[PDB]
Design an enzyme around this catalytic site. Sequence first.
Site, PDB file in Angstrom:
ATOM      1  N   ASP A  18       7.513  -2.898 -15.281  1.00 36.58           N
ATOM      2  CA  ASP A  18       6.048  -2.650 -15.081  1.00 36.58           C
ATOM      3  C   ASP A  18       5.582  -1.545 -15.537  1.00 36.58           C
ATOM      4  O   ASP A  18       4.843  -1.285 -14.595  1.00 36.58           O
ATOM      5  CB  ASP A  18       5.868  -3.508 -13.623  1.00 36.58           C
ATOM      6  CG  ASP A  18       4.472  -3.688 -13.451  1.00 36.58           C
ATOM      7  OD1 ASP A  18       3.598  -4.308 -14.346  1.00 36.58           O
ATOM      8  OD2 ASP A  18       3.911  -3.616 -12.393  1.00 36.58           O
ATOM      9  N   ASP A  37      -1.419  10.906 -11.913  1.00 35.57           N
ATOM     10  CA  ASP A  37      -0.730  10.020 -12.622  1.00 35.57           C
ATOM     11  C   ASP A  37      -1.345   9.882 -14.237  1.00 35.57           C
ATOM     12  O   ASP A  37      -2.254  10.558 -14.088  1.00 35.57           O
ATOM     13  CB  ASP A  37      -0.723   8.411 -12.157  1.00 35.57           C
ATOM     14  CG  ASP A  37      -2.302   8.234 -11.857  1.00 35.57           C
ATOM     15  OD1 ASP A  37      -2.886   7.783 -13.231  1.00 35.57           O
ATOM     16  OD2 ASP A  37      -2.574   7.795 -11.037  1.00 35.57           O
ATOM     17  N   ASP A  74       7.079   3.543  -9.219  1.00 30.66           N
ATOM     18  CA  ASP A  74       6.753   2.321  -8.954  1.00 30.66           C
ATOM     19  C   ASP A  74       7.382   1.189  -9.773  1.00 30.66           C
ATOM     20  O   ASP A  74       6.832   0.321 -10.386  1.00 30.66           O
ATOM     21  CB  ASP A  74       5.095   2.066  -9.431  1.00 30.66           C
ATOM     22  CG  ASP A  74       4.273   3.023  -8.386  1.00 30.66           C
ATOM     23  OD1 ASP A  74       4.657   3.503  -7.385  1.00 30.66           O
ATOM     24  OD2 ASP A  74       3.225   3.569  -9.010  1.00 30.66           O
ATOM     25  N   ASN A 121       1.630   4.180 -13.215  1.00 25.61           N
ATOM     26  CA  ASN A 121       2.903   4.294 -12.473  1.00 25.61           C
ATOM     27  C   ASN A 121       3.495   5.556 -13.150  1.00 25.61           C
ATOM     28  O   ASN A 121       4.685   5.708 -12.462  1.00 25.61           O
ATOM     29  CB  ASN A 121       3.675   3.405 -12.805  1.00 25.61           C
ATOM     30  CG  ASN A 121       2.942   1.759 -12.298  1.00 25.61           C
ATOM     31  OD1 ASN A 121       3.223   0.916 -12.957  1.00 25.61           O
ATOM     32  ND2 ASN A 121       2.283   1.610 -11.155  1.00 25.61           N
ATOM     33  N   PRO A 132       0.247   3.198 -17.115  1.00 29.18           N
ATOM     34  CA  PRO A 132      -0.133   4.459 -17.085  1.00 29.18           C
ATOM     35  C   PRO A 132      -0.141   4.988 -15.633  1.00 29.18           C
ATOM     36  O   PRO A 132       0.108   5.923 -15.304  1.00 29.18           O
ATOM     37  CB  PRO A 132      -1.457   4.539 -17.949  1.00 29.18           C
ATOM     38  CG  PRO A 132      -1.381   3.250 -18.811  1.00 29.18           C
ATOM     39  CD  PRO A 132      -0.729   2.177 -18.261  1.00 29.18           C
ATOM     40  N   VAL A 145       0.742  -1.191   0.076  1.00 28.76           N
ATOM     41  CA  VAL A 145       0.071  -0.082  -0.196  1.00 28.76           C
ATOM     42  C   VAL A 145       0.852   1.521   0.028  1.00 28.76           C
ATOM     43  O   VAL A 145       2.071   1.195   0.495  1.00 28.76           O
ATOM     44  CB  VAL A 145      -0.919  -0.329   1.051  1.00 28.76           C
ATOM     45  CG1 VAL A 145      -0.172  -0.172   2.569  1.00 28.76           C
ATOM     46  CG2 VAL A 145      -1.933   0.944   1.214  1.00 28.76           C
TER      47      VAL A 145
HETATM   48  O1  LIG Z   1       9.736   2.568  -7.470  1.00 33.39           O
HETATM   49  C1  LIG Z   1       9.558   1.508  -6.375  1.00 33.39           C
HETATM   50  O2  LIG Z   1       8.404   1.249  -5.666  1.00 33.39           O
HETATM   51  C2  LIG Z   1      10.997   0.806  -6.162  1.00 33.39           C
HETATM   52  C3  LIG Z   1      11.039  -0.267  -5.449  1.00 33.39           C
HETATM   53  C4  LIG Z   1      12.044  -0.866  -5.013  1.00 33.39           C
HETATM   54  C5  LIG Z   1      11.987  -2.342  -4.274  1.00 33.39           C
HETATM   55  F1  LIG Z   1      10.678  -2.994  -4.463  1.00 33.39           F
HETATM   56  F2  LIG Z   1      13.060  -3.003  -4.582  1.00 33.39           F
HETATM   57  F3  LIG Z   1      12.046  -1.903  -2.953  1.00 33.39           F
HETATM   58  C6  LIG Z   1      13.176  -0.232  -5.200  1.00 33.39           C
HETATM   59  C7  LIG Z   1      13.142   1.063  -5.907  1.00 33.39           C
HETATM   60  C8  LIG Z   1      12.052   1.652  -6.170  1.00 33.39           C
HETATM   61  N1  LIG Z   1      12.117   2.868  -6.699  1.00 33.39           N
HETATM   62  C9  LIG Z   1      13.202   3.270  -7.543  1.00 33.39           C
HETATM   63  C10 LIG Z   1      13.082   4.859  -8.055  1.00 33.39           C
HETATM   64  C11 LIG Z   1      14.591   5.167  -8.383  1.00 33.39           C
HETATM   65  C12 LIG Z   1      15.049   6.337  -7.881  1.00 33.39           C
HETATM   66  N2  LIG Z   1      16.284   6.739  -8.499  1.00 33.39           N
HETATM   67  C13 LIG Z   1      16.424   5.722  -9.795  1.00 33.39           C
HETATM   68  C14 LIG Z   1      17.377   5.597 -10.644  1.00 33.39           C
HETATM   69  C15 LIG Z   1      17.295   4.480 -11.664  1.00 33.39           C
HETATM   70  C16 LIG Z   1      16.158   3.552 -11.712  1.00 33.39           C
HETATM   71  C17 LIG Z   1      15.224   3.913 -10.740  1.00 33.39           C
HETATM   72  C18 LIG Z   1      15.098   4.833  -9.610  1.00 33.39           C
END
Ligand SMILES: O=C(O)c1cc(C(F)(F)F)ccc1NCCc1c[nH]c2ccccc12
Length: 282
Positions: free
Chosen positions: A117, A76, A135, A122, A120, A15
């Site tokens: 994944d 979004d 996401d 996200n 839209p 959530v």
């Molecule tokens: O988006 C999520 O929910 C999420 C979930 C997880 C996990 F599930 F493994 F915990 C890990 C990271 C996540 N976001 C990263 C967002 C981001 C910040 N800087 C970046 C630079 C390059 C690519 C991505 C990013």
Amino acid sequence: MENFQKVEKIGEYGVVYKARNKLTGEVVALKKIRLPSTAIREISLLKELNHPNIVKLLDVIHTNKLYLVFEFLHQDLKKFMDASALTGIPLPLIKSYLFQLLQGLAFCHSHRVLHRDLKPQNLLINTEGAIKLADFGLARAFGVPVVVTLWYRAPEILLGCKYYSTAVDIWSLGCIFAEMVTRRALFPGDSEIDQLFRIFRTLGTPDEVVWPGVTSMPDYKPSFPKWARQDFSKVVPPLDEDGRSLLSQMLHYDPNKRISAKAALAHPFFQDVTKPVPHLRL
Ligand SMILES: O=C(O)c1cc(C(F)(F)F)ccc1NCCc1c[nH]c2ccccc12
């Protein structure tokens, strides 16, 4: 929790809530994930890896649960597409949004980070005309012991390839592009096989000619029906040949022929790209 005033639930990994830091007053997106050194470390590196088309990861807290604190955006692309369904999103805005998402993908792909994944819902947007990737489906890849929409899944994923490439994100983004243009989901399947056959019925059942190695994929069956490729001018009709050409390269069956994010940015479709500001009701 307890360090945060939960303002509102904004979605369901787990959530996510709109929350307010009790001391600083910062409004953020709080992701609660119910459940390794590499996982914590690799996620923590992302806090200092930033791009304007990527949601900022502010903090990581692990106790049975993993909390991720993100920057908050009010809307979004799914909401905005529903709001714009009677009129359609203006093409300059569609073009700006596609350009920005490819910039964000080119960035994280250059750092060997896949989203996996894209949907839209996200894709976060603000009043300034920006759109940001959010996401990320990174839990499995980082090794985090955590009904699913399949509409944007690349065909190599549906056919059991265990090693995704950056190409699966280009496919998903191609599906989203088509949906912004036509205002209907391109491939709205409700099972992996229904998803695959919806793709086959539009783009033709793939074979070794257009996709070498397809018949060796883990979930490929010789008994797949053989549908002819549809006239690609039926797919996103109003769209001009620049847009259609880009879309067809984003929807190549063969992940090795599918256009990269960086190469897509150079495509003639983007020669007149601008940054309009959307009409957002918050
Ligand atoms: O988006 C999520 O929910 C999420 C979930 C997880 C996990 F599930 F493994 F915990 C890990 C990271 C996540 N976001 C990263 C967002 C981001 C910040 N800087 C970046 C630079 C390059 C690519 C991505 C990013």
